[PDB]
Amino acid sequence: TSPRNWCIKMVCNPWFECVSMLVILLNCVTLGMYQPCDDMDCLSDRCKILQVFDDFIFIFFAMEMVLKMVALGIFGKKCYLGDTWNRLDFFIVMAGMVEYSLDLQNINLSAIRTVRVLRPLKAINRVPSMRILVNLLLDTLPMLGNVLLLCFFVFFIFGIIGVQLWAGLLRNRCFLEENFTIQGDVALPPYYQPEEDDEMPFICSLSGDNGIMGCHEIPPLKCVNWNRYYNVCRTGSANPHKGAINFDNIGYAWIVIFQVITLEGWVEIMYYVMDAHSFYNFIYFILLIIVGSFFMINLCLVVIATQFSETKQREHRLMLRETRAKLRGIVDSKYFNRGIMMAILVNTVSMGIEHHEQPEELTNILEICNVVFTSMFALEMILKLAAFGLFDYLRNPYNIFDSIIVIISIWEIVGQADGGLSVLRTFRLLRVLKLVRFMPALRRQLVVLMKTMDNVATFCMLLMLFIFIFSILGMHIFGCKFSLRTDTGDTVPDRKNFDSLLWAIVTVFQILTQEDWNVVLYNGMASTSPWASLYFVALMTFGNYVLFNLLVAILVEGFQQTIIAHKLFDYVVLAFIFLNCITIALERPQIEAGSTERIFLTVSNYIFTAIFVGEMTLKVVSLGLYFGEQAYLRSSWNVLDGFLVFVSIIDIVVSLASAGGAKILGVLRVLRLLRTLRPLRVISRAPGLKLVVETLISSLKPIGNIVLICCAFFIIFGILGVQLFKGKFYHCLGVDTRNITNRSDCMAANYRWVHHKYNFDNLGQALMSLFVLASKDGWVNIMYNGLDAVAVDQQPVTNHNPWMLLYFISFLLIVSFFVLNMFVGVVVENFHKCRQHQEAEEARRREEKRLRRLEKKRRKAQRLPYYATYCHTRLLIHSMCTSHYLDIFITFIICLNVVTMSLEHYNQPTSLETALKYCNYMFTTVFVLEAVLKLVAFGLRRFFKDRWNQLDLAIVLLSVMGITLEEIEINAALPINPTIIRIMRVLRIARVLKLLKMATGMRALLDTVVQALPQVGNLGLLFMLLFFIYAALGVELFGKLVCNDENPCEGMSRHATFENFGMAFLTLFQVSTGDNWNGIMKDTLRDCTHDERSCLSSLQFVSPLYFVSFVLTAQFVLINVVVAVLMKHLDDSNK
Ligand SMILES: CC(C)CCC[C@@H](C)[C@H]1CC[C@H]2[C@@H]3CC=C4C[C@@H](OC(=O)CCC(=O)O)CC[C@]4(C)[C@H]3CC[C@@]12C
Ligand SMILES: CC(C)CCC[C@@H](C)[C@H]1CC[C@H]2[C@@H]3CC=C4C[C@@H](OC(=O)CCC(=O)O)CC[C@]4(C)[C@H]3CC[C@]12C
Ligand SMILES: CC(C)CCC[C@@H](C)[C@H]1CC[C@H]2[C@@H]3CC=C4C[C@@H](OC(=O)CCC(=O)O)CC[C@]4(C)[C@H]3CC[C@]12C
Ligand SMILES: CC(C)CCC[C@@H](C)[C@H]1CC[C@H]2[C@@H]3CC=C4C[C@@H](OC(=O)CCC(=O)O)CC[C@]4(C)[C@H]3CC[C@]12C
Ligand SMILES: O=c1[nH]c2ccccc2n1C1CCN(CCCC(c2ccc(F)cc2)c2ccc(F)cc2)CC1
Ligand SMILES: *[C@@H]1O[C@H](CO)[C@@H](O)[C@H](O)[C@H]1NC(C)=O
Ligand SMILES: [Ca+2]
Ligand SMILES: [Ca+2]
Secondary structure: OHHHHHHHHHHOOHHHHHHHHHHHHHHHHHHHOOOOOOOOOOOOHHHHHHHHHHHHHHHHHHHHHHHHHHHHOOOOOOOHHHOHHHHHHHHHHHHHHHHHHHHHOOOOOOOOHHHHHHHHHHHHHOOHHHHHHHHHHHHHOHHHHHHHHHHHHHHHHHHHHHHHHOOOHHHOOOEOOOOOOOOOOOOOOOEOOOOOOOOOOOOOOOOOOOOOOOOOOOOOOOOOOHHHHOOOOOOOOOOHHHHOOOOOOOHHHHHHHHHHHOOOOHHHHHHHHHHHOOOOOHHHHHHHHHHHHHOOHHHHHHHHHHHHHHHHHHHHHHHOOOOHHHHHHHHOOOOHHHHHHHHHHHHHHHHHHOOOOOOHHHHHHHHHHHHHHHHHHHHHHHHHHHHHOHHHHHHOHHHHHHHHHHHHHHHHHHOOOOOHHHHOOHHHHHHHHHHHHOOOHHHHHHHHHHHHHHHHHHHHHHHHHHHHHHHHHHHHHOOOOOEOOOOOOOOOEOOOOOOOHHHHHHHHHHHHOOOOHHHHHHHHHOOOOHHHHHHHHHHHHHHHHHHHHHHHHHHHHHOOOOOOOOOOHHHHHHHHHHHHHHHHOOOOOOOOOOOHHHHHHHHHHHHHHHHHHHHHHHHHHHHOOOOOOOOHHHOHHHHHHHHHHHHHHHHHHHHHOOOOOOOOHHHHHHHHHHHOOOOOOOOOOOHHHHHHHHHHHHHHOOOHHHHHHHHHHHHHHHHHHHHHOOOOOEEOOOOOOOOOOEHHHHHHHOOOOEEOOOOOOOOHHHHHHHHHHHOOOOHHHHHHHHHHOOOOOEOOOOOOOHHHHHHHHHHHHHHHHHHHHHHHHHHHHHHHHHHHHHHHHHHHHHHHHHHHHHHHHHOOOOOOOOOOOOOOOOOOOOOOOOOHHHHHHHHHHHHHHHHHHOOOOOOOOHHHHHHHHHHHHHHHHHHHHHHHHHHHHOOHHHHOOOOOHHHHHHHHHHHHHHHHHHHHHHHOOOOOOHHHHHHHHHHHHHHHHHHHHOOHHHHHHHHHHHOOHHHHHHHHHHHHHHHHHHHHHHHHHHOOOOOOOOOOOOOOOOOOOOOOOHHHHHHHHHHHOOOOHHHHHHHHOOOOOOOOOOOOOOHHHHHHHHHHHHHHHHHHHHHHHHHHHHHHHHHHHHO
C-alpha cells in the first residue's frame, strides 16, 4: 500500500544495512568498555556517556524495527516475522524495552541487564557469507539429535551409577577422637587437611567401606606427632574443591561426568573416588573415557561432517651491456640456485645457535656471519637487477621480498645506536621464508592452504563473534567475583579472572582449549551458585563439539632347499610371542637380583631367543638371505625380524661378558631398550595388523607436505621464542617472593634461584616448550611465564608484557589449523582410494540387493497364526493390544522411571525414599503386566525369534528379583550383604535400554559404527600393542625415579609412576588422553641429589623424544579409527 511504499525504498536500501551493521559494531564497542571491578553504580564520566551511547543504540534499534514492520507487514511468510533473525531482532527490542522500563522503576535487577549480551548476535544476518554459513549450520543441526540422545544415554547411565555408588562419600575427611583432651591453646583443626584450607583434602574411607586410604596412612608431621591423633573419620563439612566435586545429587554427577568427558582434572577425581569407596573404580572411569569421551564426541564430528555434506548436496541440487644474456645463463644454472639455497640453510642454522650466556667469541662470530650473508644477498640483488633489468626484477614479487630482506638487513647493520638492535634482529626470520621460492611441492601445498582459507575466513569471523559474546556474558555474571583471598596481605585476583575484557577473552579462549578450565569452573561455581556450571557447559559444548566440527566439515567438503612346512607355523609363533610378552611384562626394576623371578626371566629369555633364532634359520634355509630374488631379505618384515634376532644375539653375548662391566653399562642399557621393542613381530605374523600398518603408512605420505610445513613453523617460532626470551625464566621462589627484584636480592634473602623447566634458553628447549604449547596442555603456565618475564636476571612481575599473548595464541591457532588440515588430508586420501573400488563391489551388492527385494516379495503372507490367536480369549491381545498406542504407554512409564531414579541424593528424606519404593513397585507390576500380555499374544516360536522380547524378559526378571529381596530386609529373614542390594539398585538402570527399540535412528548410527569393526578392531589392537611397547620402554627408562617428599612429583601422583609395569601402563593411558602429560615429563627430566645414575643419565636427551613420539603415534592411531568410521558412514549414507 501507499504507507508501506513510503519506507520500502529506505529499508531496502543497502545503505540501511550498512548503517545497521555500523550501529551493531558501535553497540559491541560500548559493551566492551564495561569494567565490573571498576564500574560500580555508574558514578563516573565514562559510565554515564556509555549509558548515553547505549540509549542511542536502543533508539536506533526501535526505529529500525518499527520501520521494518510498517514496511514489510507482520506475522506472515513475506511479513516481518518471516525470517529467523527478524524475530531475534524483535526479541532484543522487547528485552531492551522492558530493561529500560524497569530501570525507570529504580530496580537494579542485574539479571536482565545481562540480556544485552545478545545484541552483537544481530550482526550474523548482516554479512551474507555469515548468513549462508549459519543458515547451513542451523539446517544441519536437526539431524544431530541422534548423537545428542546418545549423549543423554551415556550421561544418565553413568550419573545414576555414580549417585548410587558414591553418594556423599566425598565428604568424609579425617576427624579427631570423640572426647579429646587438650590443655589449651586449641590449634588442632577439627579434621586433618595436609594443605592450608582444603584445596587438597584427605578423603578417608569409612569403616565398612573398603577404600585404600584409611586414616592410618597420614604423614607424620616433621617433636610431637600431632597428626597421629586423627583416629576416626566421619562424613561432614564439604566435598572437595570448595564444594564443587561430589556425587550427592545427579546434577553434580553430571558435572563430574562432563569434566571427565573433557579429559581435564581426571585422575584427581578418580583418586578421590578410589580414596573414598574402592580401588576397583578405574573400571568406571576408563569405561567412561573410551565410550563417553572418544566414541561419543567423535561420533558428533562424524555426524556433523556427514550431514553437512549432504545438506550442501541438497541445497546444490535445489539449483539443479652485451653481457646481460651471458650473465642470465649463470642465474638459472641449476647449481647457483642450490648454492644460494645452501647459503640460506646455513644462515638459519647460524641463527638457531644463539642461546643464554652464549660464549663471548660466538656472538662476534655470529655478527660477522650475518654481515657475510647480507652481503651475499645484496650481491644477488644487484646481479639480478642487472642481468634482468628493473622491470624484469619487479615482475616476480619474490624478488621484491628479497630486496626487502636486503634493505632491512643493511639498515640493521647501519642501525647500531638504538631501536634497530631490538627489532631488526627479530626480522631476520624472514630470511628463512626464501625456501618456498625453491621447494616446488611447498608452492602447491600453500596454494591449496589459501584455497581453504578462502572459506575458513567466514568461519573465523563467526568464531570471534561467538567468543566475544561469551566473554561479555562471563564478564557480566562473574565480574569481580574471583577475588582470591589474602595470601601476602592483599586479595590478589586470580590470573584467570573475568575482571577486564582482555582477561575475559583470553580466559574464554583458555576454556575453549580445555586447559585448566576446571579451576575456573570450581572458582566460579563456588562463587555465584552451583548453577553457574551451565555457562561453562554451554560454552565448551557449543564451541568445541559444534563450531569446530563445522570447521572440519567445511574443510572436508571443500576438498571434495630342505623340506619346508608352512601349514600352521604363524599361529604357534604368535603364541610364543604372547608368552614372551608376559615375560616382558614383569621386569620391574625392583625384583631382587638372584631371586626366583630373575632366574625365571633369564631362562625364559634364553628359550624364547632359541625359538626365534630357530625360526629365523628355518626361514632363511627356505629362502636364502639375499641370493637373488624372493630371498629372505626381500621383504621389510623379515628384515625387522632379522634385526630383532641380531640384537638378541648381541645382548646375550654381551650379558655373558658381564665380567668387566665398566664402560659397557651404556651398551647394556641400549640393549635392554632394544629388547623392549621385540613385541612388534605380531604385525608380521598376523594379517590384519600387517594390512592396517601398510594402510597407515600409505595414508601417511599424502600429509607429508603439511607435516614438513608444520615442522618448519615449529623451527621458525622456536627461533623467534629464543629471540624474545633468553634467560628471563628465572624466579626467586621463597617464603617471601616479594619486594625482591634481582638475583642479588634473592641471595640477600637466601631463598633460591629456581629455574623453570619449560623455558626458551636454547633452541631445543624452545622446541620442547613449543610442543607443550601446541598440544593444548600446561600451556597456560608457559603463557604466564611469558607475560611475566621482565628482563635477563630479575623477578618476573604479573602481566609485565601483555603483548606476548599475540605470540602465545598465534602459535596455538596456526598449529591447530595445520593439524586440522592434516586430518582432512587423511580422509580425502582414503575416500579417493575406496571410492575408486567401492562402486565395483557395491554394483554386485545392488544386483544382490534387488534379490533381497525379491526375497521380501516371497515374504508376503505365509498364513500368519493370527487366526489361531483369534477368538481364543486373546482375539484382542494379538491385534488391539499390540498397537503403538500400547507402546507409547511403555515409553511413558520408562521416562517416569528415569525421572524417578533421577531423584536419589545423599541424606534424602525418608518419605521420598518410601515414595520411590512404591513407584518401583508400580513400575515392576506394570512391566510384569505387559510381559504377560506379550507372552499370551504369541507362543514360544517368536518368543525366541524377536531377539528383543528377551530383553524385556531379562529386565522383568531383574525387577522381580529386586522387589523380592526388598522383603528379606523388611522381615530380616536372612542377613543379606548390603553389596547384593547395592548391585540390585545399581542394576535397576537396565530398565532404560527398552528405549532402544523406538530409537531407530540410534540403531542406525550404532550399526554404522558396528560395520566399521574390521578396521576399528585392527586399529584398537594396534593401539594396545603401542601401549605395550611404550610401557615396557618406560619401565626400563624411568623405573627408578623415586617419588617422595624430597622429590616432589607433579604428574605421577600415586599409581601413575613407572615402577611396576601396570603402574606405567596406566600412566601411558593418562598421557595418551593428554591430561597432565607435561607434568609427567617435568617429573622425569629432574636432576636428583646424586641418589642414582638414572637422574644424572641421558634422560634429558631421550625423555622428551619418548613422550613426543608416543603422543604423536597415539593421536594418529585415533585419527585413523575416526576416519575409518567416517568413510563407512558415508558409504552407508550412499545406500
Ligand atoms: C619437531 C616437533 C614436532 C617436536 C619437537 C621435537 C623435540 C621435542 C625434539 C627435537 C629437538 C630435541 C632437543 C634438542 C636439544 C636439546 C638440548 C638438550 O641438552 C640441554 O641443553 C640440556 C642439558 C644440558 O646440556 O645442560 C636437552 C634435550 C633437547 C632440548 C632436545 C629435546 C627433545 C627434542 C628432541
Ligand atoms: C566484521 C564483524 C562480523 C566482526 C564482528 C566481531 C566484532 C563485533 C568484535 C570482534 C573484535 C571486538 C573488539 C575487540 C576489542 C575491543 C577493545 C575494547 O576496548 C577495551 O579493550 C577497553 C578495555 C578497558 O577499558 O579496560 C572495546 C571493544 C572492542 C573494540 C571490541 C568491539 C567488538 C569487536 C570488534
Ligand atoms: C544456551 C543456554 C542453554 C545457556 C546459555 C547460558 C546462559 C543463558 C544461562 C546458562 C547459565 C545461567 C547462569 C547460571 C548462573 C548464574 C549465576 C547465579 O547466581 C546467583 O544466584 C545470583 C542471583 C542474582 O542476584 O542475580 C544466577 C543465575 C545465573 C545468572 C544464570 C544466568 C543465565 C545463564 C548464564
Ligand atoms: C597376554 C599377553 C598378550 C599380554 C598381557 C600382559 C599384561 C596385560 C598382564 C599380564 C602380566 C600382568 C602383570 C603380572 C605382574 C605384575 C607385577 C605386580 O607387582 C606387584 O604387585 C608387586 C608389589 C606387591 O606385590 O605388593 C603388579 C601387577 C603386574 C604388573 C601385572 C600387570 C598386568 C600384566 C602385565
Ligand atoms: O576444542 C578445541 N578448541 C580449540 C581451540 C584452539 C585449538 C584447538 C582447539 N580444540 C581441540 C581440542 C580437542 N578436540 C579434539 C582434538 C583433536 C581432534 C581433531 C583433530 C583434527 C581435526 F581435523 C578434527 C578433530 C581429534 C579428533 C579425533 C582424533 F582421533 C584425534 C584428534 C577438539 C579440538
Ligand atoms: C638489584 O636490586 C637492588 C635492590 O633495589 C638494587 O639496589 C640493585 O641496583 C639491583 N641491581 C644489581 C645489584 O645489579
Ligand atoms: Ca591439563
Ligand atoms: Ca587437555
